[PDB]
Amino acid sequence: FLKSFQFILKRQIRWLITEMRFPKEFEHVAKIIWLKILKTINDQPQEELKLQ
DNA sequence: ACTGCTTTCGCATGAACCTCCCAACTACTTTTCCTCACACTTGTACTCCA
């Protein structure tokens, strides 16, 4: 799920910069927000973790 | 007695089905998700009523 939810998150940001004149560092800010999101997923016990 | 009913035969060689289970077309359950409203209890505000 995380491999595709990131893949769709990628396609939303790649729309913004290419068309709505967003600066290229907007993707760079978004990854740290995405990566720390994954660490919260990481901290949960893998058996029955139920990431929201 | 001659009755009936048998029966054996034939020109070479060449070519000359029945349930049953799977299919279409529907519906209704399946197998896990995220998203809050509700019921109280301590709390702070109210104005007393003598």
From Swiss-Prot:
It is found in: Nucleus, Nucleolus. It comes from the Eukaryota. Present with 398 molecules/cell in log phase SD medium. Although it shares weak sequence similarity with SUA7/TFIIB, displays a similar subdomain organization as SUA7/TFIIB, with a N-terminal zinc finger, a connecting region (composed of B-reader and B-linker regions), followed by 2 cyclin folds. Component of RNA polymerase I core factor complex (CF) that acts as a SUA7/TFIIB-like factor and plays a key role in multiple steps during transcription initiation such as pre-initiation complex (PIC) assembly and postpolymerase recruitment events in polymerase I (Pol I) transcription. Binds rDNA promoters and plays a role in Pol I recruitment. After binding of UAF (upstream activation factor) to an upstream element of the promoter, CF is recruited in a SPT15/TBP-dependent manner to form a pre-initiation complex. Component of the core factor (CF) complex, which consists of RRN6, RRN7 and RRN11. The CF heterotrimer may further dimerize to form a hexamer. RRN7 interacts with RRN6, RRN11, SPT15 and RRN9. Belongs to the RRN7/TAF1B family. This is RNA polymerase I-specific transcription initiation factor RRN7. It comes from Saccharomyces cerevisiae (strain ATCC 204508 / S288c). The chain holds residues 104 to 155 of 514 of the full protein.
